[PDB]
């Protein structure tokens, strides 16, 4: 019930529908950084899997469960709510692993497991880490975890930093300026320019960028999956205080994330930072409707507030001010309706 109480049925339907397509499974699997890093984290920490009981939350086609099997797991429960669970069981049979991988269809909040597990594996990260709200299901699954059990990934770091990108800003500004026309085919649309700018700038921009646009060292917010409770993710407050390293216009904040697999042999990191090879998560940028001017040495301070919604995403509120001048910017963004600019 925990899942259905926090998600609107309609949104949950299209969510699991989307993940029922083999095309989408291929798109994630082809991300070699993602898939190779997961296999590295599991195989190089084989002692965390040898003869262990494993739970794979949201297994999709089952790839992570096959990795756990390669590392020596005795039994893997692979739970998946989408229709992809049928395809995972096909692969388990065709790979002759029916004695080790047990697919359990359904939501991890609703299924029944015959025993507790030694370790949980999953890929719960969406855009900006938190999109899709799957981290809550990942944390919810800890009810099946033995007292000192491990979790792969173990921690997650969200990074944020201010950036300058006049071209991106003007791109979105010019789109909104379509509603500034006083005679579009003889019709005055100008009364809607305010609503247009609001709508367009609520869209986080998902693409990659060169690190030269960042105007300060990132601030990091860490979630320890071993300790966090799923309710901790309903309201995420990220205060920030940036020491500006460059002078110029701050057009918004850029976001990315890293996760760490903290195994008994080594810690393996999966990073989506703009300094690292591109992944299918890219990076996320929240634009200010009006940029803030800042000088090198100034401090940009404020709060990024993420409130979970029933569409398996978050309402984003970013309040930022230049302390030296009192220049202030307040912004509201809709993480579930981003602008995919990558081309």
């Amino acid at each position: 019930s925990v899942f259905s109480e926090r998600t609107e049925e309609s949104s949950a339907v299209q969510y699991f529908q989307f993940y029922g397509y083999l095309s989408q499974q291929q798109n994630m699997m082809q991300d070699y950084v993602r898939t190779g890093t997961y296999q590295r984290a599991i195989l190089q920490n084989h002692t965390d899997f040898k003869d262990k009981i494993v739970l794979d939350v949201g297994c999709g086609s089952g790839i992570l469960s096959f990795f756990a099997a390669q590392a020596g797991a005795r039994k893997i429960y692979a739970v998946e709510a989408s229709t992809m669970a049928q395809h995972a069981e096909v692969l388990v049979k065709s790979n002759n692993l029916t004695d080790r991988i047990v697919v359990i269809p359904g939501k991890v909040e609703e299924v029944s497991l015959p025993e507790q597990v030694d370790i949980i594996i999953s890929e719960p990260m969406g855009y900006m880490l938190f999109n899709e709200r799957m981290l809550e299901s990942y944390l919810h699954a800890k009810k099946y975890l033995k007292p000192s059990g491990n979790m792969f990934p173990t921690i997650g770091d969200v990074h944020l930093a201010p950036f300058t990108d006049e071209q991106l800003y003007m791109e979105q500004f010019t789109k909104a300026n379509f509603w500034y026309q006083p005679s579009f085919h003889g019709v005055d649309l100008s009364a809607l320019r305010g609503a247009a700018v609001d709508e367009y700038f609520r869209q986080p921009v998902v693409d990659t960028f060169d690190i030269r646009i960042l105007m300060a060292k990132s601030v990091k917010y860490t979630v320890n999956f071993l300790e966090a409770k799923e309710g901790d993710l309903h309201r995420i407050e990220i205060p920030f205080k940036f020491h500006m390293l460059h002078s110029g216009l701050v057009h918004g904040l850029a976001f990315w994330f890293d996760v760490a697999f903290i195994g008994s042999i080594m810690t393996v990191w999966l990073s989506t930072a703009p300094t690292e090879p591109l992944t299918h998560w890219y990076q996320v940028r929240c634009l200010f409707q009006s940029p803030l001017f800042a000088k090198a040495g100034d401090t940009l301070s404020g709060t990024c507030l993420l409130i979970a919604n029933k569409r398996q995403s978050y309402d984003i509120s970013i309040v930022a001010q230049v302390d030296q001048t009192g220049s202030k910017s307040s912004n509201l963004l809709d993480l579930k309706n981003p602008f995919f600019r990558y081309t």
Binding site: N27, M28, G126, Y127, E132, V206, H280, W281, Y282, P338
Partner: peptide, 4 residues
């Protein structure tokens, strides 16, 4: 492509 990306994850949504």
């Amino acid at each position: 492509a990306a994850r949504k």
